[PDB]
Structures are given as C-alpha cells and as structure tokens.
C-alpha cells in the first residue's frame, strides 16, 4: 500500500460540465472549504476540463 491521508490535501472529483470526463480536484483545502465548495457543486457550480476550455 501507501499513505497519503493529510488535512488540506483533499482529492473531490467532479466532472468536465460539457463531456462528463473525470476532474479529480485535487485541492488543499480544511473540511469547511471542502464542505462548502461541495455545497457549490451539488447547487450550481461545475468545471470543466482544459481539453473543453481549450475547444470551447
Ligand atoms: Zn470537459
């Protein structure tokens, strides 16, 4: 195995908005930024990937 479990350093995958394809956010961010970008996403917010920001 290994070990990489910190604070911050938090991986919340969402999506690319316009092709579903995996954005894993790899963030740093405390358990209430996490909590509350999370309410952002599950609301209203997405992204998208740099391939889709490129093309459009
Ligand atoms: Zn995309």
Redo the contacts with the bound molecule.
Sequence with gaps: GSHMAEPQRHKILC???????R?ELTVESSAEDLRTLQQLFLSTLSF??P???TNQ
């Design positions: 999506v690319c908005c316009k092709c579903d394809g954005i998208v990937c391939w889709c920001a």
